[PDB]
Symmetry: C4
Subunit: 389 residues, 4 copies
């Protein structure tokens, strides 16, 4: 085997509904299954297999450790995986490492797994290459060192990973790590709008450039948009100029007055957002998702734009279809690419959390839409789950 | 590995009882298992493995989502598989894609999986090659785009698949897709009796010809019998002329008066029907199955005829044996071929549904009969399942 | 890969306790597991893997299909397997074929699986090579066609299998089948004492000879002892002359008066009995087991004799150790050989049935003793199972 | 494949928290899982996989055989394994052999599994190579023949294994076995302080030397420290001279007066103790663990020393971090090494037993710390388990 590289995307002009992973369809009192209580799911693929990752609270439904599964960082939290298509239950899953923030990626030869844990004021990112623990990176703003919550991206054996550190309601200047066979070989300090950037959903815009659509949890409902040159290992960041604000909460589209850099209103709070690339011979499509509701983690819609500079185009994004209706949950979303024989298939997954407050369990299903065929996005996704069962 | 082709069938002159997959033997209140609630089971094999496919309601027994498992098309429905011989439970199964109509096939190199979902008036057939979503085909009569509910058939890397679209009580003109590495490369429009054809059970009658025995749900209890030339990609369809009507409901054998094309009576309603080929040096056997009851989905008998043209022979089909007695359920049946070292073993599977009305769960067992040895078919199959447990 | 042959056994002069497979340790009401209800367990090994076979009633503990699991031949009965060392539960097992009597063996290249089902008066032995159903053999005395209930034996790709047919309290003249790549290529009709022989535990005494220790259920408590020449495909059968009667029930050792052929008393009833070969350069050891009790299926002892002719030696068999004490069940026992890198390891397995009458469940554990090291057999085996749980 | 040898350790200067295997997070009355009741866990790795071993009581939680799971040696006890990262439940585990004391190791080509069972006064160590039972070694001081309770160590296909025999409150002179392809090829009788030595945690200090840190249960709270030359097959043993006594119970550090050989006080009782090597070009680090409490099996601290002779250095060991706080259980600990592509990753596992007295169940979680990155050990481990559930 040899190193993997981004290829031209597979033919198609529309996303369609692909697969639902709803493991809680199986966590009834009256049932006999043990789906793991998770959140922050995400898929990463290699040349032969696609793995469905998530952060588990080390509990199952039905269980007796529902208390604290609405929290985020504890000492029991773990990065787990199953082959995509398998229900992530206690026995099906494999536990990779302790983590309350995670990522993973295949480089053609082997899986890199990333997972941050540690105290809040001195957390610690850890890297595992296949079976071996290989490296770590230390907290630099001493306020909750975090990572992508989605797939990292490897080119010629170099995996690139966003990490961030800083306040949730103040400065969270992010960084990128360059990782080779599990070991950190460069710190890349981005330039530009670096005020606050977290949970980058990165993908290859081409062999030269990784682009990421991130979360600002303090200042704006515009997504910070990262452009990384993987040949000079240089990174720049500016807000997305589009009127189609992709964060949640957000104000009305086009209502943020001023040039492309204006913050301005409803910018505190946020949400991880889907983003994936469709690479064609002489054209690039940028697919995105955002909640159907402006203030709440309900529904998910798919948007798209072809070419241009996202840093300057105020043009509205083309609404492509309703993936999760306003009546269903749509929490985190993320991009990934399945590898066909000679081309890459761009997909967007959606974390569809089952939220009943802190007095019960708290987990998520996963909805997957992929680029397949021509025409219009046809069907929405439901979890099917009743949380009283 | 190289592409697969139909071979001469293994020696034998009789079917025998081979295997029972009854996963609800294990879904008792008192038990500790989770068989998946399914219907439309079907088996397809490649050179080293036979996979047992079904359409699941994304529910298990015992569970709490029995309501709606007597329906057919919903947003939770999925194509699932296990290795044939494994009980399809929550953890053993792999979920392939969202589907309320399905098919699958191996071409020598890889698995093609076919699944239709979407709204009733604009459904959408989707194709997955191994792990990648590769292609789609759109609704053309805007009334419930359907596929085979059984194995597709690949020759020299070209998989051929029946699709139909149309009213259940009127015109449902079918089509064939020719699929190569997961992508559609030709639409084949059949000629002749094309009034209504659905759920074709197709097999290779040879290296030149796919033949299918199908359902007409409107007009006749004679099966539409499709002959597809895979060298010119041309398809012709006519009713089976035999007095041994294979659909359900049906009238008395021989009682449909007139030439081979006469409809005539009890033609509305139907059932998917077993059919598999026994290819000998200079002789072809055609094995079929049909319910033991004339109006109900009870029992299943095996029939056979050697040579001739099914389009013209009114000759009764030879009753070969009672596979499932009149006292047991016999719903859908389908054909498939296991690959021995140097020859192909023709088999017929039987969907044996556990029907207790819409106020309880609704799933199926799977009975398998294969061509093995000489003599007379010896033993019938029972599910052993009591639905009250 | 190439065909397998018997080799010289591994160094050692004593059996020791190896492994217990007691799946019902896990079938409590208060538990969350589903061990399969079985009987007639047996192990067969190939060059990389040892498989643990059993006949299942298609039920689990805890379940609701306990009624009829004390019977033997029904329509739900199946041959199942797990990798030796795995608990045979619903999900771990693979179902091979419908069978109420079975056997299996590896030939170096692939698994042959044998299973008889069918009506009592016209049962049917079926053969499956890997995934394919390949051949069948018909009932010849129209009274319960049966097979070994243990591993068949393959040499240079020819697997040899005892089958019997006939009354349980009268004549049951056995036969041997010679099987190549799943197909029957010769019927071998044994000569000599052929009055009644069933459940042969066969092994290779060398490259030229298969020997079997069998059950007579009518006439004697001496084991019929089969010697098969695999070079001329000829079989001969005579009672075992030893005073150490291996059947159950049996009279006192040495109390059957007359020459080696005398029946005489307590001969009706019987039990399948362990037997395995230790092949050394210029010496052959014959290891056997028999119940600790003379009339009941309680306890199991290991016996041994080096060289001689079992057909003529009235010498007592050397008592080698107590494998299951008189307080624990010892039902069927069987021999098998694990393959080390350059030598074969002879083993004896013991079916330890959990019997509580027909008003509850009826299954078995499996105790394994193998040839390992020097000295005296050290420890006995218990199921650990309380049947009220 | 070829034989494996100790390599230079991977870069790093600190241990960090890696993974928690807490299978009882899933053994609630309210749940639907079956973790196995175990103790004496330990990990051993080969070139592609790390296996998590334990000694099971052949019972699960929840279940009905909690009585006797606080004992140690019974006839049901087994050596079991899962792939490290998998929860050891009934179905995930593989049962290797009956054992109430165990070890295992990869040699580059295959797994050796070691397991002692038998009566107290004539126990029996058994060896299995892959699938085959290959050899045994007999009790020599007729008082509980014991082995390491952790990974053996293979160099050039020779696996070396500590065994001990003797009273728990008197003389237990240990021995080493040298095992090749599952067969014993040399007995090594150590010299020096051989009064009492059990449960050696051995690793390669280099290509020439295995070193072990062991338990004296009678005489001292200093660990016996074994140095084995694998080129001349000679072993020597002396107390560790450090003031940082690693056993439990123990007195105050430095308070044992006299030279390096002084016993003296609180020496009865003991605990198996973590110990792993960090091999650098021209420097060796020795990492150890010991309970946070002086008398109780509570907490676990990581210690380290670079170079010197542990037989003579009274220097205090460097306290490196708190792995399990005083509030959590810290029973047995052990060392092991994961294999990265070109270097070995030293790790220390911690048995974190759930002890509620003999009137309830008794099993353990497993905490893993590995050498990864630079800086200070950052986070402690908790089981998360409430034993009332
Ligand atoms: C750390 C700040 C960040 C934004 C508030 O918290 C995230 C919000 C979450 C959320 O908004 O869904 C869930 C994440 N588990 C959480 N992250 C971590 C690493 O704990
Ligand atoms: C669309 C009508 C058609 C036959 C009239 O429905 C089928 C009948 C069924 C049946 O005849 O058993 C069950 C099938 N699950 C169903 N098909 C779909 C695709 O939903
Ligand atoms: C045909 C009778 C014969 C001996 C009495 O049968 C065996 C007896 C049995 C027994 O004595 O345990 C159990 C076996 N399952 C049984 N075989 C069948 C095929 O039913
Ligand atoms: C035999 C003496 C030894 C030290 C007292 O006992 C050990 C005590 C234990 C303990 O002290 O944790 C657990 C061990 N499972 C047990 N050993 C065996 C091999 O059965
Ligand atoms: C990227 O580079 C590799 C060669 O290194 C090439 O095979 C691949 O086609 C290129 N990808 C794109 C998207 O051009
Ligand atoms: C079909 O063609 C292939 C060669 O392409 C051949 O190997 C096979 O035997 C043929 N099958 C039949 C049924 O004639
Ligand atoms: C049996 O024959 C084969 C060669 O065909 C040989 O390799 C093997 O050692 C022989 N077995 C015995 C037990 O002599
Ligand atoms: C040990 O020896 C082998 C060669 O046999 C070598 O490859 C390896 O690097 C050596 N290990 C150390 C720690 O020096
Ligand atoms: Ca925001
Ligand atoms: Ca009809
Ligand atoms: Ca008898
Ligand atoms: Ca001590
Ligand atoms: Y399970």
């Amino acid at each position: 085997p040899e190193w993997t590289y981004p290829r031209l995307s597979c033919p198609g002009s529309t996303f369609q509904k692909a697969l639902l992973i709803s493991p809680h369809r199986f966590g009834e009192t009256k049932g006999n299954s043990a789906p793991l209580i998770i959140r922050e799911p995400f898929i990463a693929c290699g040349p032969k297999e696609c793995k469905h990752f998530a952060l588990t609270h080390y509990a199952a439904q039905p269980g007796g450790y529902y208390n604290g599964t609405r929290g985020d960082r504890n000492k029991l939290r773990h990065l787990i995986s199953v082959k995509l298509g398998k229900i992530p239950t206690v026995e099906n899953s494999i536990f990779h490492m302790a983590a309350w923030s995670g990522s993973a990626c295949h480089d053609g030869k082997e899986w890199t797994y990333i997972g941050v844990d540690g105290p809040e004021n001195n957390a610690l990112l850890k890297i595992k290459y296949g079976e071996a623990y290989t490296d770590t990176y230390h907290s630099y703003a001493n306020n909750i060192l975090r990572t992508q919550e989605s797939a990292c991206n490897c080119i010629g054996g170099n995996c690139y990973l966003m990490i961030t550190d800083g306040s949730a309601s103040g400065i969270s200047e992010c960084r990128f790590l360059k990782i080779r066979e599990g070991r950190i070989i460069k710190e890349i300090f981005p330039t530009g709008r670096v005020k606050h950037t977290e949970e980058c959903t990165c993908g290859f815009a081409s062999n030269k450039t990784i682009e990421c659509a991130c979360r600002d949890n303090s200042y704006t409902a515009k997504r910070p948009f990262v452009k990384l040159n993987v040949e000079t290992d240089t990174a720049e960041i500016r807000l997305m100029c589009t009127e189609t604000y992709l964060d949640t909460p957000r104000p009305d589209d086009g209502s943020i007055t001023g040039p492309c850099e204006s913050n301005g209103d409803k910018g505190s709070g946020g949400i991880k957002g889907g983003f994936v690339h469709q690479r064609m011979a002489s054209k690039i499509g940028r697919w995105y998702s955002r909640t159907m509701s402006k203030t709440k983690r309900m529904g998910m819609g798919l948007y798209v734009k072809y070419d241009g500079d996202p840093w300057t185009d105020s043009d509205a994004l083309a609404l492509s279809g309703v993936m999760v209706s306003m009546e269903e949950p749509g929490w985190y979303s993320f991009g990934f690419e399945i590898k066909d024989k000679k081309c890459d298939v761009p997909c967007i997954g959606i974390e569809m959390v089952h939220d009943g407050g802190k007095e019960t369990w708290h987990s998520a299903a996963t909805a997957i839409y992929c680029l397949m065929g021509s025409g219009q996005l046809l069907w929405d996704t439901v979890t099917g789950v009743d949380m009283a069962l």
